[PDB]
């Protein structure tokens, strides 16, 4: 963009609050250890994306046993909703919301698309989940 204008998307890859979200996994694993494992795992399973899934702050919902997932890039957000919903025995009337950088990702996006836009410097994609549709509420 030197003869044309480069636009900025709306509410897509923004992270206005909290910046990069706070995660217990980051506090418990130092950065260089995470980055080293992220690089190696992207080379070993290039068709899969490493995802960290943790409960959002103030969320009222069952905790997740395993937080480290290796997800096929072609998998959509909706299928990931389906998978996480089963692992915590969510009832039919229980809601489930994902947040990536304090933003709800489109249900029709693939995990590879989210990875490319939101992966952090350790080569991991971080997803928080909640029973509420607003992060931290
Ligand atoms: Cl990808």
Q: Ligand 1 center to residue 72 CA distance, Å?
A: 9
Q: Specify the resolution in Å.
A: 2.0
Q: Ligand 1 center to residue 74 CA distance, Å?
A: 9
Q: Ligand 1 center to residue 106 CA distance, Å?
A: 16
Q: Ligand 1 center to residue 88 CA distance, Å?
A: 27
Q: d(Cα 116, Cα 123) in Å, to the nearest integer?
A: 10
Q: Ligand 1 center to residue 13 CA distance, Å?
A: 16
Q: d(Cα 136, Cα 47) in Å, to the nearest integer?
A: 32
Class of domain 24-130: alpha beta
Q: Ligand 1 center to residue 47 CA distance, Å?
A: 7
Q: Ligand 1 center to residue 21 CA distance, Å?
A: 21
If phi > 0 it is left, if psi is from -120 to 50 it is alpha, else beta; for residue 123 that is left
Q: Ligand 1 center to residue 128 CA distance, Å?
A: 20
Q: Parse the chain into domains and list their residue ranges.
A: 24-130
Write a three-state SS string for 19-77.
Answer: CCCCCHHHHHCCHHHHHHHHHHHHHHCCCEEEEEEEECCCCCCCCCCCCEEEEECCCEH
What is the residue whose two structure tokens read 């899969």? Answer: 48
Contact status, residue 119 vs residue 125, Cβ threshold 8 Å:
yes
CA dist list (Å): 37 to 26, 28, 87, 107, 129: 13, 14, 25, 28, 23
Experimental method used, please? Answer: X-ray
């Amino acid at each position: 963009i030197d003869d044309t204008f480069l636009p900025v998307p709306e509410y897509i890859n923004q992270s206005v609050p909290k910046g990069s979200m706070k995660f217990v996994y980051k506090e418990e694993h130092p950065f260089e250890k995470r980055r080293s494992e992220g690089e190696k795992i992207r080379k070993k399973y290039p068709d899969r994306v490493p995802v960290i899934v943790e409960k959002a702050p103030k969320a009222r919902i069952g905790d997740l046993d395993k937080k480290k997932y290796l997800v096929p890039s072609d998998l959509t957000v909706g299928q990931f909703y389906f998978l996480i919903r089963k692992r915590i025995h969510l009832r039919a009337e229980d809601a489930l919301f994902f947040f990536v950088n304090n933003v709800i990702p489109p249900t029709s996006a693939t995990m590879g698309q989210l990875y490319q836009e939101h992966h952090e410097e350790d080569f991991f994609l971080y997803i928080a989940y909640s029973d509420e549709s607003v992060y931290g509420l």
